[PDB]
Amino acid sequence: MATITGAQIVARALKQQGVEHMFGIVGIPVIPIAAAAQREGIKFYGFHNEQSASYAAGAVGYLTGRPGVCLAVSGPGMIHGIAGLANAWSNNWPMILIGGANDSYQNGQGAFQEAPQIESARPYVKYAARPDSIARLPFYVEQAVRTTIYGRPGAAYLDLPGDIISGSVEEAEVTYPGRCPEPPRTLAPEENIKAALAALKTAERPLVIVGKGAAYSRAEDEVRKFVETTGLPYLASPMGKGVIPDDHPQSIAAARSFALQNTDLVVLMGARMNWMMHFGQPPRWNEKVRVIQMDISAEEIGTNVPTEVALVGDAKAITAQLNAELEKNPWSYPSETTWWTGLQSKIAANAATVEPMFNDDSVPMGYYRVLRDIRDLIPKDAIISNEGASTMDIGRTVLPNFFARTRLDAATFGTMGVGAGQAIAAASVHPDRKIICVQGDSAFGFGGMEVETAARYGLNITFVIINNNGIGGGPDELDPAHIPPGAYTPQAHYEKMADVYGGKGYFVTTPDQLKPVLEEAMAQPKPAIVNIMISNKSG
Amino acid sequence: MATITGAQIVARALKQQGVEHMFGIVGIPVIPIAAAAQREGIKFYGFHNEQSASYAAGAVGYLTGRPGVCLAVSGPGMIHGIAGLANAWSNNWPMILIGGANDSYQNGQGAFQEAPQIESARPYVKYAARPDSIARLPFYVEQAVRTTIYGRPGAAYLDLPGDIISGSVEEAEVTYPGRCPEPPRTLAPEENIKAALAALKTAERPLVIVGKGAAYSRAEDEVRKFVETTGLPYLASPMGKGVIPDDHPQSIAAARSFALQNTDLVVLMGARMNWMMHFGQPPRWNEKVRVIQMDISAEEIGTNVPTEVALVGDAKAITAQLNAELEKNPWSYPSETTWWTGLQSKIAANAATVEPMFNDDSVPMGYYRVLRDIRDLIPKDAIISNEGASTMDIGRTVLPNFFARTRLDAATFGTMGVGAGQAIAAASVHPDRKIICVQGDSAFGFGGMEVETAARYGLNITFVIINNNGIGGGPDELDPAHIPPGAYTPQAHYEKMADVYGGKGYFVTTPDQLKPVLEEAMAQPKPAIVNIMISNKSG
Amino acid sequence: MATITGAQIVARALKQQGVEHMFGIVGIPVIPIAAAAQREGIKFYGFHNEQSASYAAGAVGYLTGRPGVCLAVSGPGMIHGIAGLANAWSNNWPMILIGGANDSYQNGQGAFQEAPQIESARPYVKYAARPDSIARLPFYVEQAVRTTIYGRPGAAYLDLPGDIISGSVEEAEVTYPGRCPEPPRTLAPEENIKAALAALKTAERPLVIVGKGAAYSRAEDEVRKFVETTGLPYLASPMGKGVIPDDHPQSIAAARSFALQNTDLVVLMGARMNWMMHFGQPPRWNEKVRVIQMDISAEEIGTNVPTEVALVGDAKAITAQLNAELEKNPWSYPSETTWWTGLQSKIAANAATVEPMFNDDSVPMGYYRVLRDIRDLIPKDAIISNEGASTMDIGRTVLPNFFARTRLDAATFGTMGVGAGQAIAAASVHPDRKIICVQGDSAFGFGGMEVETAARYGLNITFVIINNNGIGGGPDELDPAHIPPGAYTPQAHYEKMADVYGGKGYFVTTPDQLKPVLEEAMAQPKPAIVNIMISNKSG
Ligand SMILES: Nc1ncnc2c1ncn2[C@@H]1O[C@H](COP(=O)(O)OP(=O)(O)O)[C@@H](O)[C@H]1O
Ligand SMILES: Nc1ncnc2c1ncn2[C@@H]1O[C@H](COP(=O)(O)OP(=O)(O)O)[C@@H](O)[C@H]1O
Ligand SMILES: Nc1ncnc2c1ncn2[C@@H]1O[C@H](COP(=O)(O)OP(=O)(O)O)[C@@H](O)[C@H]1O
Ligand SMILES: Cc1ncc(C[n+]2csc(CCOP(=O)(O)OP(=O)(O)O)c2C)c(N)n1
Ligand SMILES: Cc1ncc(C[n+]2csc(CCOP(=O)(O)OP(=O)(O)O)c2C)c(N)n1
Ligand SMILES: Cc1ncc(C[n+]2csc(CCOP(=O)(O)OP(=O)(O)O)c2C)c(N)n1
Ligand SMILES: [Cl-]
Ligand SMILES: [Cl-]
Ligand SMILES: [Cl-]
Ligand SMILES: [Cl-]
Ligand SMILES: [Mg+2]
Ligand SMILES: [Mg+2]
Ligand SMILES: [Mg+2]
């Protein structure tokens, strides 16, 4: 009778549960898993460090609604992968770390790479399991996948001893669960839907905030209809950008600080009152601000600031409830108020502030001058990976998104080291699209070796480094006796790393080079690296 | 009156406790800690990834007997550094990870990089503390330091909320403990000393195993005297190499398998019966092997295999006891026995096997041909960082050490990613010496960016890459449809990364290039990278 | 061929490793373990609550130097037993908690009493393991036992899934390790021994502190010799009482506060500078006290106060080193010093203060009057379980111990709930001796049901209750509208609980009852309960 190994069972089960992308580094005892994954049609990418690979797995979860898988060897391989668990935990992204473990009959002997891996994953996962036996592996795979995507999404860890992977059972002894179905999109009570709309009608300065929860829910159509029907001003969080196109006339992103400080009623659509929103507290918010909060996690309701109307459930379903109730009882915010006037004035004052910076041609160059030529060459449906400090914060302001889930950045954990991994994930999920990775020089160095990974798999990524010689800048000449802790080699020629795989690297210092270099670099058949020097005083 | 910040208190206490080397990446909230560490005379190295920096910290502990410090930001910074905690835990090396945390008065709010950092470090540390107040910081620093180096050495984690770092107290409020003394060197009972020597006199095929615990104990003088007085055959573990010079006539390294399989009594001097020694069990050991075990950890005694004589205490002190008892009652193993004859015959047969490989000039080249020329140009007091699979395992055989603590490799955890970090740690500890980094191509990619860190600090490191196109080898041409999980870009020109910082990169394919290229590379004032292609069949 | 279950294997291995006492409560799946333990000759005691049972296991470890075993069912049974693990952790006593677990093939299903038991035990154990297979069970038992008694003693947890317990293997597949030997008694370097005695000679006001680590080391004969040879004053910690007989002329126990405040050099013999010693800090100690510290734990050296001479190793062996060096170089503290004269003055005042209270016959009675008659009737070799607040702290003062390891109290963790369990442990280890349990009324209530356990097994235990109607005293009359949080029913007749098992209960309120009742109760063939009312203003 026919037999099958644990590795093959895991690969077949993962494929059945909708897993399509796997990132990691092979080695004892997970070599057969990557091989069986390739034969099952799962796309496997061999990275240079599991850290970057584990970040890629979480980004796949955000982009597709099914967990990406990070495959790691026992011990230090799994521990490197904890970075991606924690990032997925922080952003509530579906993600599975699969870590090898030493053979179970060697526990307690000081086996090769013996480590407490379950306990190391526990703080950051919704689910951690070591399968008891080979025949029950599909049980744990299905339960892990379902746990990552049902409820508030998050991370799972599977601990596979080497003898579970390499052992075999009779195929007739293995039961496979059906593919985990899409999670149920739960709805708010009818009274909360009505109380939320009634509350909006009493507000003098209302504001909608569209966060990456709305983007993960795939709610862009419902959100856009809700914002347009109500005529409400809206603000997109960094990764909420593009749920509504960033050029929409009701966006007040250029008046963000004014809007947050003066709004009296905010509608949080899949966004938390966490550090990114200044906890919804003074001085950045008004002391008496009223909150309508839409979130799949009931425990998030009322964090930091009380919530007047709680809308617990799926953002797509709940926003459809609001649009349906607005169909029965139409209402819109007026086009001319003192609120719109003040918002429109601040937007105009901001345009006056940034225009001299956008057209500043002095050398060394500023952020705005460089991001202007980058922005004007990105395809409209390209996916942008944007990572750094000022590179990423100004990048958020200058680089628009016109579709949902097309910006990947440092997100809630503020992580450096996600840039190349998230770009590789985006390229894997969207093979037909252009991927633009825009990183600060420090951010680039966290996962720089993965440019070769992008070349090896033929990924349509272009790497742009905005280089000010360090973390928020570094001197033009290093004094060997006093190297600042956050400085790097002045004018480090990172673009030379393209020569590792036969790609093209460009070194840019003057504004006249920007457009012809960025154009020729984006048309390259291999990933190009564009290294753009900027002033260490720019900001 | 005069005041002082938490960051300055921590830097001063660390310096008082004998900390000399700090590796990490700055950012909120640890920016002032690196600044104050430099003002106290602590050498701070800004890395490209905290993963590599945390590995450097553990290597410093091994090399110096005082913990190296890894400095990481809150959240993902600290989580990246968990790699170093686990490596230090695996090797019992003294090491401190200092992790920033969010301001304490923002706990529970979703603060920037809020994370359960103590619980993340817990599985791998002997000590984890969040200092309760600024004034007590020196209490925690001394307790952390003392705990890493007393008893079985291990890792510590210090959790520093931003307001503990940035807040101030009056200088007269702070008490600084004295410098933590050297740990007391404990002795074995005198009857155990006599029983051990008595047991040795009954053995027909005795063997000494010199492990890195003897190296860490700084026991080289007593261990060499003990082996020479007794005339016993000895086997050095990978990082035990050099405790006795590797050209010593009593080394049976080239007959290792024969020695372990047939010995009837082994003396473990700071070495574990773990996976490296195949658990001391059949078939690689004899079923009835008798064990004299010398370890500072009483709990380690009798793991896997029963121990006949337990010598619990410090290796230097216990070996001095053995030498003093041999001085009162002399004894030595006879220089002509059938045991010696078999060992000598196996060593000679091994020399006949490897001589053709050492002199094989065929292209693409093999490991032995390449390592032969590396070996002959390495200074005798150089420090070797050797990392990979066959690159490291063959490197252990071919590259000799003549002094203790001059080899750093993947060690007990089998970690890829330590190579450059441990090389940088070695250069920091021994600035007067040449550091040779010999890695496989895959190993090099785990932290290849750190070659720029080596250049930025002017470290005397030469990076040698032994490149077979992947993990255990990769094909000469990649099939875009079928990319092997462990392959990299064929003939990837990693030496081009030397151009990032203005160094010299060399690409070697034939034996005639080896000697002049390695000679010119080692004499470079900046770190050179030598990329050496070998066959993917070799190993 | 002959087969054997996992339960029978575990019972056989525990017996081979020196385990002689098992306490717990049976149920799925540990029922076969208790039965097999009885057939092996292990004494099994069925308690009424795993909490009390787990406290008995730790006490067995302290008394015998081999771990007592607590046997608990899966889930809440094991969780109840964590109390004992934490107490053993706090006191560094060897103990094993053996917890059942649900069948491994039901993991993830919501099985009966499925719970994360290893992670629940982790913070308090030196060792936690789920055996991977039935045939390797003896490996884990020996490793667990060895880990509890080697090094600094502590607790271990064995997680046993029901299918490991109930399954069977062929006896020829099971290898049993040899009995774990007594750990080696490690020595301090000879220069530290000389340094300690040399520092002793420079002291103006030297003091010896004898802790329960010296008692656990079985070092009483060496400690008594050292103290008598040097003529030094000594203080016995609560459970260090009896190491030297409490009526020894050199005891300064009655001048404890004066001695700690004025000593300029203390010899700590198995005793910590923890909360019990007020951290060795002012105002209770002198700011400049010098410390000679003798402890098996290197990490304990130098906690809170610097240590001038560290003596790391076994108390018995190291004290014998001190006595041997005092034989080569005799020294003794002079008579007629102001130190001894000041101490004897303080001792005489204390004796004069308490003698009125010893003879005060007023009703309600006081602590000293009651404990005077208890003291005058306890056999010299009896074992005293003394628990509560004032009942225990004054009991420490009034009830002397003449042999080592004859006082069990709340110890380092200050735990209520240990009294009856530790009395049952003591009766199990020393069946030939009288056990006296002297508890406060609140302390008695924690484990009161276990008086039936003592009667069921014919244990020679007398239960004395000192009753002041609550935690540190409650009112004479309870108003139902305002019941104090720490008060109990006034004059609660706990002695009526002897009638549950057909024993004798006594209720005592006047001094003329004390002697007749106590004499009658101690001669009972079943455990008697003496409920002694005392004033709530006493103490
Ligand atoms: N399907 C869904 N429907 C509604 N809310 C969701 C859904 N999935 C996740 N969320 C919530 O969206 C929120 C996203 O918040 P956050 O990550 O802070 O967004 P941003 O960073 O864009 O402000 C999380 O609190 C999460 O619980
Ligand atoms: N000062 C010391 N004296 C004696 N033994 C020590 C000392 N420090 C550490 N050790 C022990 O040395 C052992 C080294 O074992 P291991 O790392 O397996 O060596 P190797 O890998 O070289 O065989 C550890 O068990 C550790 O407890
Ligand atoms: N065999 C031994 N020899 C010496 N010290 C020991 C031994 N076993 C345990 N100890 C130590 O004895 C100390 C007991 O301290 P503690 O419990 O505070 O005593 P006490 O409460 O009586 O003051 C612990 O620090 C422990 O490490
Ligand atoms: C894992 C991790 N380590 C460190 C940090 C701290 N940090 C925040 S931004 C940054 C780099 C900023 O420099 P760069 O990417 O060059 O951007 P710039 O601001 O100079 O444009 C670092 C190290 C972090 N957020 N995450
Ligand atoms: C953190 C970590 N990830 C993965 C592995 C698995 N592993 C062991 S050796 C190795 C690299 C082997 O390739 P290379 O360095 O080129 O050496 P070669 O054997 O080809 O000479 C890898 C990835 C590991 N040990 N540690
Ligand atoms: C597990 C636990 N719960 C609670 C306490 C708090 N506590 C300390 S002493 C004590 C009892 C005091 O009353 P009693 O035993 O009657 O003694 P008395 O002082 O009245 O003589 C209690 C509950 C504790 N130490 N441990
Ligand atoms: Cl979260
Ligand atoms: Cl040197
Ligand atoms: Cl403790
Ligand atoms: Cl005391
Ligand atoms: Mg920068
Ligand atoms: Mg290779
Ligand atoms: Mg009471």
Author numbering:
A (entry chain B), B (entry chain A), C (entry chain C): 1 to 539
Which of the paper's sentences describe this entry?
One such enzyme is 2-hydroxyacyl-CoA lyase/synthase (HACL/S), which catalyzes the reversible cleavage of 2-hydroxyacyl-CoA (2hcCoA) into formyl-CoA (fCoA) and an aldehyde or ketone. Originally identified in the mammalian α-oxidation pathway of 3-methyl-branched fatty acids, HACL/S has demonstrated remarkable catalytic reversibility, as it is capable of condensing fCoA with various substrates covering a wide range of aldehydes and ketones with different carbon chain lengths. All the enzymes are tetramers, specifically dimers of dimers (α2), where α2 dimer represents a catalytical unit. The three domains have specific functions: the N-terminal domain binds the pyrimidine of ThDP (PYR), the middle domain has a regulatory function (R) and binds ADP, and the C-terminal domain binds the pyrophosphoryl group (PP) of ThDP.
Structures of both TbHACL/S and ApbHACL/S with and without acyl-CoA indicate that there is no notable difference in main chains and side chains except for the well-ordered C-terminal regions. All structures contain well-defined bound ThDP and ADP. All our HACL/S structures contain bound ADP in the R domain, which assumes the Rossmann fold nucleotide binding unit. ApbHACL/S has stronger activity on C2 (acetaldehyde) compared to C1 (formaldehyde) and C3 (propionaldehyde) substrates, while TbHACL/S discriminates less harshly between substrate chain length.
